């Protein structure tokens, strides 16, 4: 229940498949992390509530809550939670995915795949999007969209 | 078989590690949520 950033693990041996954000009692991650499976949280069960494969996003126990957006000018911080590593903030200035439907911030940071769903933050600490859906530009130079949903 | 574990607060960290380029790229997004470069 409590606000924060969370590892998404699967069970022999336990593996970290992703990361998500708990906020206002809703758990937010990317679709390709969970494929909409139910998540266990202590004794409780979080059930998928909204999902969209095209946005690659899913929310549990309620509608998507994160609504902040990149201002197009300022540095941001990826709150990376890599498997086996404590959460760490990586500051960067986003580049830009230019699409027919407008510009989307993008971060040229390459962390292990179990870090998908890690929140990207603005200077007030508001989650402006999730990390881990993107493109490669030339030889594994991965660039992640700052993927944000609609509240 | 999927479960979650708390990893931290959602906080900006003053004076964090700073890295990464800021490329500007033309991209298309298909129905499967796949980004691809366009020219």
Torsional class of A129: left (φ above 0), alpha (ψ -120 to 50), beta (otherwise): left
- Mutate one of A6, A15, A85, A128 to test the B interface: name it (highest B CB count within 10 A): A6
Experimental method used, please?
X-ray
**C-beta separation of A72 from A105 below 8 A:** yes
- Chain A residues with CB under 8 Å of B17 CB are 88-91
- Considering the domain A4-60 in this protein, what is its CATH number? 2.40.10.120
What is the architecture of the domain spanning A76-145? Beta Barrel (2.40)
The C-alpha torsion from A66 through A148 and A61 to A18, rounded to 10°, is: -120
Give the pair of three-digit tokens for residue A69: 């957006």
Give the pair of three-digit tokens for residue A47: 């059930």
- Chain A residues with CB under 8 Å of B1 CB are 10-11
The whole-angstrom separation of Cα A77 and Cα A68 is: 14
Q: Concatenated DSSP letters for chain A?
A: --SEEEEEEE----EEEEEEEEETTEEEE-HHHHTT--EEETTEEE-EEEEETTTTEEEESSS--------SSS-EEEEE--TTS--EEEEE--EEEEETTEEEEEEB----GGGTTPEEE-TTS-EEEES--EEE-SSS-EEEE-B----
- Mutate one of B3, B16, B31, B37 to test the A interface: name it (highest A CB count within 10 A): B3
- Chain B residues with CB under 8 Å of A55 CB are 33
Domain locations in chain A as residue ranges? 4-60, 76-145
Instruction: Find, in chain B, the residue whose alpha carbon is nearest to that of A82.
Output: B7
Query: Resolution of the coordinates in A?
Result: 1.9
**CB distance A98–B32 less than 8 Å?**
no
Judge if A4-60 and A76-145 fold alike in CATH terms: yes
Residues of A involved in catalysis: 32, 56, 116
Q: Which of B4, B17, B26 sits opposite A6 (nearest CB)?
A: B4
């Amino acid at each position: 229940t409590t606000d924060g950033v969370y590892r998404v693990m699967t069970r022999l041996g336990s593996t970290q498949v992703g990361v998500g954000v708990m906020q206002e009692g809703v758990f937010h991650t990317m679709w390709h992390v969970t494929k909409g499976a139910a998540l266990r949280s202590g004794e409780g069960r979080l059930d998928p509530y909204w999902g969209d494969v095209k946005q690659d996003l899913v929310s549990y126990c309620g509608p998507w809550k994160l609504d902040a957006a990149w201002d197009g000018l300022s540095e941001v911080q990826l709150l990376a939670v890599p498997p086996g590593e404590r959460a760490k903030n990586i500051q960067t200035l986003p580049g830009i995915f230019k699409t027919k439907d407008g510009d989307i911030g993008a971060v040229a940071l390459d962390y292990p795949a179990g870090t998908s769903g890690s929140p990207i933050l603005d200077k007030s600490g508001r989650v402006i999007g999730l990390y881990g859906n993107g493109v490669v530009i030339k030889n594994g130079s991965y660039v992640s969209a700052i993927t944000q949903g609609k509240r | 078989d999927m479960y979650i574990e708390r990893a931290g607060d959602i906080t900006w960290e003053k004076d964090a590690e700073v890295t990464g380029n800021s490329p500007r790229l033309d991209v298309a997004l298909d129905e499967s949520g796949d980004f691809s470069l366009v020219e």
